[PDB]
Amino acid sequence: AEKEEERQEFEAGLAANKACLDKIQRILSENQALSQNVHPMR
Amino acid sequence: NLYLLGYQHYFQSKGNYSVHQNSHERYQEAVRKVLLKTFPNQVFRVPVTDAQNFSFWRSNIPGVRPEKAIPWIKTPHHCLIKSPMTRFVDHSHLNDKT
Amino acid sequence: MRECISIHVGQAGVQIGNACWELYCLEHGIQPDGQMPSDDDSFNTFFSETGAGKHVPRAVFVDLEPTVVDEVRTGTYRQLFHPEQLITGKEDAANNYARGHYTIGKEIVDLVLDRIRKLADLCTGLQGFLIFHSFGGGTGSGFASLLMERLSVDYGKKSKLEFAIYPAPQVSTAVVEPYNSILTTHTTLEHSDCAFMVDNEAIYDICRRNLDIERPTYTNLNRLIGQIVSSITASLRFDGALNVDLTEFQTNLVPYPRIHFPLATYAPVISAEKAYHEQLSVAEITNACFEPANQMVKCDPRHGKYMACCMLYRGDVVPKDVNAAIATIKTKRTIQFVDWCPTGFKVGINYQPPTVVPGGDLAKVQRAVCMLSNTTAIAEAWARLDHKFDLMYAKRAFVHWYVGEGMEEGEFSEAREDLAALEKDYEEVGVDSV
Amino acid sequence: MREIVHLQAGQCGNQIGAKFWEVISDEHGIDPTGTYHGDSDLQLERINVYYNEATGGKYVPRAVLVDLEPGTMDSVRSGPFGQIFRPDNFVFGQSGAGNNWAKGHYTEGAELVDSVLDVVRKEAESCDCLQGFQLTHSLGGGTGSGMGTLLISKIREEYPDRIMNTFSVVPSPKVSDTVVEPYNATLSVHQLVENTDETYCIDNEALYDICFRTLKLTTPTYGDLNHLVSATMSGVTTCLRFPGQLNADLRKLAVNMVPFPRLHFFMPGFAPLTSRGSQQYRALTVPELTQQMFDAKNMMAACDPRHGRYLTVAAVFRGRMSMKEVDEQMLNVQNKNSSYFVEWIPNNVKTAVCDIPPRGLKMSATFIGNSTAIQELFKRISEQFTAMFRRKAFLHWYTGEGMDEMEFTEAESNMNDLVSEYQQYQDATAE
Amino acid sequence: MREIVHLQAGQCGNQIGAKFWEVISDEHGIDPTGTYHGDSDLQLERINVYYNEATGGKYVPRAVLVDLEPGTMDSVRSGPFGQIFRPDNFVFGQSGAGNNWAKGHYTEGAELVDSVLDVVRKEAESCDCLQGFQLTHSLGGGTGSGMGTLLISKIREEYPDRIMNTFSVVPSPKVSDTVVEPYNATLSVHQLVENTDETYCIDNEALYDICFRTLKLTTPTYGDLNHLVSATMSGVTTCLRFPGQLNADLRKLAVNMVPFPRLHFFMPGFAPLTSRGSQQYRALTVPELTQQMFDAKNMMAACDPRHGRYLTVAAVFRGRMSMKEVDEQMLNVQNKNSSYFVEWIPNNVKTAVCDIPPRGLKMSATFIGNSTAIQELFKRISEQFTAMFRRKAFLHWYTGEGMDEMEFTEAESNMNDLVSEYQQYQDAT
Numbered sequence A: 001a002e003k004e005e006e007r008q009e010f011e012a013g014l015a016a017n018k019a020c021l022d023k024i025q026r027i028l029s030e031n032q033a034l035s036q037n038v039h040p041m042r
Numbered sequence B: 001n002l003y004l005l006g007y008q009h010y011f012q013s014k015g016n017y018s019v020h021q022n023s024h025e026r027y028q029e030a031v032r033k034v035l036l037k038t039f040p041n042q043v044f045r046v047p048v049t050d051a052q053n054f055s056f057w058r059s060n061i062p063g064v065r066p067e068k069a070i071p072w073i074k075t076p077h078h079c080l081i082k083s084p085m086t087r088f089v090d091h092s093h094l095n096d097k098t
Numbered sequence C: 001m002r003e004c005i006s007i008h009v010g011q012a013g014v015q016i017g018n019a020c021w022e023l024y025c026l027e028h029g030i031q032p033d034g035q036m037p038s039d040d041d042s043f044n045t046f047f048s049e050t051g052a053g054k055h056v057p058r059a060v061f062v063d064l065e066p067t068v069v070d071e072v073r074t075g076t077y078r079q080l081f082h083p084e085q086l087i088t089g090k091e092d093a094a095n096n097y098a099r100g101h102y103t104i105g106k107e108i109v110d111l112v113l114d115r116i117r118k119l120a121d122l123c124t125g126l127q128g129f130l131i132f133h134s135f136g137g138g139t140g141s142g143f144a145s146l147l148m149e150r151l152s153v154d155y156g157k158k159s160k161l162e163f164a165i166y167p168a169p170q171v172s173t174a175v176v177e178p179y180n181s182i183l184t185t186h187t188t189l190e191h192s193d194c195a196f197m198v199d200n201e202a203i204y205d206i207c208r209r210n211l212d213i214e215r216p217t218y219t220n221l222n223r224l225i226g227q228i229v230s231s232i233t234a235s236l237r238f239d240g241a242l243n244v245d246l247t248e249f250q251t252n253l254v255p256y257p258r259i260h261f262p263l264a265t266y267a268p269v270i271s272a273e274k275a276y277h278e279q280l281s282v283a284e285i286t287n288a289c290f291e292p293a294n295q296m297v298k299c300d301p302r303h304g305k306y307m308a309c310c311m312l313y314r315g316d317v318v319p320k321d322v323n324a325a326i327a328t329i330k331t332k333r334t335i336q337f338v339d340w341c342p343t344g345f346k347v348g349i350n351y352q353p354p355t356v357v358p359g360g361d362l363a364k365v366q367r368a369v370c371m372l373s374n375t376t377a378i379a380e381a382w383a384r385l386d387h388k389f390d391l392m393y394a395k396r397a398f399v400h401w402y403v404g405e406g407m408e409e410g411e412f413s414e415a416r417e418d419l420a421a422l423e424k425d426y427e428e429v430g431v432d433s434v
Numbered sequence D: 001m002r003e004i005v006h007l008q009a010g011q012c013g014n015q016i017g018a019k020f021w022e023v024i025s026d027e028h029g030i031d032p033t034g035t036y037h038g039d040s041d042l043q044l045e046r047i048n049v050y051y052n053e054a055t056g057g058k059y060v061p062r063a064v065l066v067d068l069e070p071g072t073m074d075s076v077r078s079g080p081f082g083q084i085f086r087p088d089n090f091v092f093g094q095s096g097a098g099n100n101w102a103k104g105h106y107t108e109g110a111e112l113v114d115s116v117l118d119v120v121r122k123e124a125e126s127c128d129c130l131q132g133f134q135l136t137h138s139l140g141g142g143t144g145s146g147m148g149t150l151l152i153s154k155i156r157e158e159y160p161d162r163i164m165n166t167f168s169v170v171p172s173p174k175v176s177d178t179v180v181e182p183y184n185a186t187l188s189v190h191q192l193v194e195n196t197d198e199t200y201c202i203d204n205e206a207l208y209d210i211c212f213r214t215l216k217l218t219t220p221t222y223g224d225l226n227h228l229v230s231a232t233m234s235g236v237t238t239c240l241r242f243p244g245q246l247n248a249d250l251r252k253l254a255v256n257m258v259p260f261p262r263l264h265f266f267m268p269g270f271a272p273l274t275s276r277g278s279q280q281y282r283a284l285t286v287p288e289l290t291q292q293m294f295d296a297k298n299m300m301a302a303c304d305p306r307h308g309r310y311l312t313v314a315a316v317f318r319g320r321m322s323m324k325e326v327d328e329q330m331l332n333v334q335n336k337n338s339s340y341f342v343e344w345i346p347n348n349v350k351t352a353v354c355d356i357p358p359r360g361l362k363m364s365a366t367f368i369g370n371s372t373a374i375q376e377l378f379k380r381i382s383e384q385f386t387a388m389f390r391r392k393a394f395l396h397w398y399t400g401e402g403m404d405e406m407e408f409t410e411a412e413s414n415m416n417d418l419v420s421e422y423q424q425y426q427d428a429t430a431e
Numbered sequence E: 001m002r003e004i005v006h007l008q009a010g011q012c013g014n015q016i017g018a019k020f021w022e023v024i025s026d027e028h029g030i031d032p033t034g035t036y037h038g039d040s041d042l043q044l045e046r047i048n049v050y051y052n053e054a055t056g057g058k059y060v061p062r063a064v065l066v067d068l069e070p071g072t073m074d075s076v077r078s079g080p081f082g083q084i085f086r087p088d089n090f091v092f093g094q095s096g097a098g099n100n101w102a103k104g105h106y107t108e109g110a111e112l113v114d115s116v117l118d119v120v121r122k123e124a125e126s127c128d129c130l131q132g133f134q135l136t137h138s139l140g141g142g143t144g145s146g147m148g149t150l151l152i153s154k155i156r157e158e159y160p161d162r163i164m165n166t167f168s169v170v171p172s173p174k175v176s177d178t179v180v181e182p183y184n185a186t187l188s189v190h191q192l193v194e195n196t197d198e199t200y201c202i203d204n205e206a207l208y209d210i211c212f213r214t215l216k217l218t219t220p221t222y223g224d225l226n227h228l229v230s231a232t233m234s235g236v237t238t239c240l241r242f243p244g245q246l247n248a249d250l251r252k253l254a255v256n257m258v259p260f261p262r263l264h265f266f267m268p269g270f271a272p273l274t275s276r277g278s279q280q281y282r283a284l285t286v287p288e289l290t291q292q293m294f295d296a297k298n299m300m301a302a303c304d305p306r307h308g309r310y311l312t313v314a315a316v317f318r319g320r321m322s323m324k325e326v327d328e329q330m331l332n333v334q335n336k337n338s339s340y341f342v343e344w345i346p347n348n349v350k351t352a353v354c355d356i357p358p359r360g361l362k363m364s365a366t367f368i369g370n371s372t373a374i375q376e377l378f379k380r381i382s383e384q385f386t387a388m389f390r391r392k393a394f395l396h397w398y399t400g401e402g403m404d405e406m407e408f409t410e411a412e413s414n415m416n417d418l419v420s421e422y423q424q425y426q427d428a429t
């Protein structure tokens, strides 16, 4: 049972890494340099 | 990027909040007051702390024996029987010093 | 009727007492809430009946750091323990005997005294005070010393057994441990009746070699200490052919009032696969109790000579096999005895075999034995501690702390000379008049 | 109970603690607005160590942020956890120091030392049993190196028994941004030796070395650097907030780290730092933590400890480890290296265990060690301070502040006397 | 338990190890990801010898791949079994030595040795009971011939008791691609005699002949050359990694192989080398294996043993087999070729048995031998080294590195002293 639990923890770590890579892809697709303020004549 | 290792919240990965409304002073008063409905085993599936893994095996339900739960704690019980005169003197010296 | 009060001090005291009380509830059948609704006496030496039929342990868990006690108050046995018994401080000594003895302990001495007074009032004829602590921690050293000093004058006659973590010779959880260990030996010298020094390194070696646990925690040690104390108290809690109380193994273990340091040894301690292929017998366990590998303290009795040896046989033991094994041990030049003790074995016998706790490591076994040997080979441990403490104190390291807390510097040399005199007394005992 | 008031000094101090407080609120499951959404009853069991209670299930900072310039603090109260602090604990003046230690210590500091003394007294009396304070600051500025010294000296008189930590940022010679640096540093360590229970020497160039090599980060900002010192000083009080098999606190290490009152400077280091090419090829274990830690490349100070002797060594481990493997390694490093450990102190190592693992990780360790290599920093600073002072360069800025000249002379002298006696403890016969 | 750390230096070293690390991964059922996919239990019982445990059922080689030029490591990383090696074990400088032994040994090597020493100490300490180290390099290069001698020199001082094997590559006189080859060769063998437990002389010319006539390959590349050497290097330690009827290991042979410390050069051979036409006409028997061993044509060294005397002979056989022929095959070859064996040592043959056969084959065998004809190559190098050194040609390159010129004379004197006493053991009564 102990080794089964450790194996499932390892799988959970893999899943978390996959999810963070996918959201890295999404924020790669996003594009902005606004910094909450464009120059006042733009 | 120091920790883009998977976050893996420990306690989230593995009741009394309703009692004390997530208030520290209420929880301190409670733990001084017992009044905790739930237990380490009763919440957490894997033992977190040292004395939690110490006391992970048990049941809170009053009508349980680990004896019937798993049969190897079955041990012949050669217990002394305190004789009636022995109890007489015991309780007697307890309540009356003479 | 016969009663023992637990006075556990420190983090070590609380964890060890938790182990002991878990095991005690397991054998006596008391539920975690504190009931035994199986539907006598026995538990009466440890538990105490309440008005509504609940059983209360006779223990005063004390600590100067809160979290150790709050874990117990939120554990499983929260309802089992009466909340006033568990006594906590707001700051610890932080490995500092001076803080534990002079600045912090005196605040809580009165409260713990009142609590033990209540427990002793509840008892009617009290047998013993089992007091558990560690020589390393500041609380479990200094506050333990002060409670010994006051307890000796409060209850002048009563027997005060002392189980104490002695600092390991090689591994250490502290750097300032030797000063506290030296300064506590004065109080354990003049205010104790028996001592049971326990070494973590030796328990590590025993558990790794025998129990096949390549990676243990403190709980694995705690189960073994609980088994030791349960073996001690089994003659008092369960029916036996030769019952042995606290006073008898107190009397037939101490040759001189300055020598109250015997060594415990438990046998058999083997895993269940290790037991599946072993026949277990009285001769086997009593020969395992003499091996230097199974010695619970990092000392070698073949370098010294036994003056006393108390046996506690338990289970389906037969005194025929007990006496045959004793004769086999005696007919051996392998075991030296001093010239002034031709007879040195103290047999006690109990019927009920030791119980086994799931989550433990020991296997269920029909028979077992405990050994309490007072031998003179233990002098070398204080000799190593003397060397370390002297080469500590030569450059006056860490002394400014204790001085600022408020203990005068001459007491360091005083305690050093005292334990040197104790060592010389051990040498005089080891001398034979042949 | 056991409370900490987090004192904050300078742009270094504000940015360091803001990352630090970001870490701890995540350690205790606190949102940027202030409540507790977590499911860990033990996260709330000891939350009063750092936070104070507020109405509506809110928990507030027990911090006092200090600066001499208005620009830094809006950066704090606009960031990831800006709104969690409260505007009253924000204390700061109208005029900066210009990296001038004298201005923040004598001329401009005196107008503001009152108000910060007011607020810290209220955070002190708010708690029942305050364990002690804590400051993060830099020895390279004008306020943290300056005002920061003036703050400590007063509250030492006010609260003598309470412990006092300081994560002082010491300047680097290889990378320095300030011409007037040596004057501030020499005039501050003289204040540190007299009035401080505990100091950790953090050097920025070492953090730049650790990120380039072990981390292989392409473009490190100061935010990565701030995260390092936060995880270190999370690992010092971790045993204080959570239970463990063998507990400790700051005072447990403090008595165990100071053989003599003149020596309270230590070399923090972190165990589990690996690059992203190293994560796949690893197997976390107690030895691998000790291998990564004892490597002198890993240390966050600015000196190699093979040139000196280890006086005392601490290792605060965090997670779930078997203790036989813990103590056997600490004995093992003492036996093998028979030249880097002092002989008059056998069993040089203090070890503590906290059960709760670090945030985002399964195993970790933190290290505090006293070596003789710390004197390598000062004598190198004295190499520069004397070079400044023999020609009285940059002196009219400090002289015009109203101080005399002998204060410089006593500063180096006390600094010279420290390293002189420190050298003696390296070459000392035990027997 | 009994672990080995695979040292690796030079382009020859990097390519030979990558071929080697693939071969044992195929033996032990390790995928290019790094997990375990094999079937038998014995395929994963002693994996700790060459592989170190990593999380998630991951195994990583205990290798230290070193090269002074960064270009080779990309080829190592781009190979089929490239990603398995940990990046931190790759230690590399920015500038090479340019086939100069002096630049590798003194000027450029001194900057890189401590990094390799750090990784070597890191990997050696990880194993609790290390059997010894093992290095593959070439004597005709600049790094393996150069700083490769420097890393050997240090670790003997640091780790004296551990075994040190060198599957070193010796230059050929017939086929040479390096003008300054004797200069690096003469200044490397002097390093070997002082600090080396055993050496296996590898000559690339001999393998070229083997592929031409034995396997009859049309276009032999370096991979096939690497395949042969890797097969030999696997067969040395196969008895260590797997149980056998008559087990052995590195120290079993080395204690039994060499009678004096000055002679630690061997002559390694592999039995099952047959062309594809030869498979259809063959019967796989132990006598056929023994017949293919003792023939000098099968041999991968640059010498003919028929001109000298076999001092000691080791034969390590692999696979399920009945060992009655083995004792008599070595006995028969001892009596027949009596003149080729020295008389002061009867029972010259040492034999071991490993039960687990190689993958893709039923029977296999390896031969380690110390013979007197090994002096033929050293005296040949003396012909070329002295020819270049009399006129002081190509010397300013080494001279500009700060060394003196007495090192050349003492290196020449030492190997002359080596072959002289080696010649003496040939004519002994």
Ligand SMILES: Nc1nc2c(ncn2[C@@H]2O[C@H](COP(=O)(O)OP(=O)(O)OP(=O)(O)O)[C@@H](O)[C@H]2O)c(=O)[nH]1
Pocket: C009, C010, C011, C012, C013, C015, C016, C063, C064, C065, C092, C093, C094, C095, C096, C134, C136, C137, C138, C139, C140, C141, C165, C173, C174, C200, C218, C221, C222, D245, D246, D247
């Ligand atoms: N065998 C054993 N020893 C323990 C255990 N817990 C603590 N110790 C010992 O206790 C010593 C340190 O003292 P602690 O018990 O942790 O704390 P303390 O006695 O209250 O002293 P302070 O920390 O200063 O308050 C260490 O050297 C340990 O060897 C335990 O569970 N089992």
Ligand SMILES: Nc1nc2c(ncn2[C@@H]2O[C@H](COP(=O)(O)OP(=O)(O)O)[C@@H](O)[C@H]2O)c(=O)[nH]1
Pocket: D009, D010, D011, D012, D015, D016, D067, D068, D097, D099, D138, D140, D141, D142, D143, D144, D145, D146, D169, D177, D204, D207, D222, D223, D225, D226
């Ligand atoms: N590592 C690190 N160092 C910083 C950071 N912010 C500032 N510093 C250092 O602080 C120094 C400037 O401090 P300064 O603002 O003048 O201090 P003050 O006068 O007390 O406000 C510079 O030398 C920086 O190296 C940071 O986020 N990380």
Ligand SMILES: Nc1nc2c(ncn2[C@@H]2O[C@H](COP(=O)(O)OP(=O)(O)O)[C@@H](O)[C@H]2O)c(=O)[nH]1
Pocket: E009, E010, E011, E012, E013, E015, E016, E067, E068, E097, E099, E138, E140, E141, E142, E143, E144, E145, E146, E169, E177, E178, E204, E222, E223, E225, E226
């Ligand atoms: N048998 C064999 N020889 C090789 C291989 N790669 C290189 N070599 C030989 O090694 C020599 C070049 O060595 P070099 O790369 O300069 O060694 P380095 O200076 O240590 O890197 C050439 O003469 C080749 O014949 C290989 O894969 N197999």
Ligand SMILES: [Mg+2]
Pocket: C010, C011, C065, C092, C137, C138, C139, C140
């Ligand atoms: Mg304590």
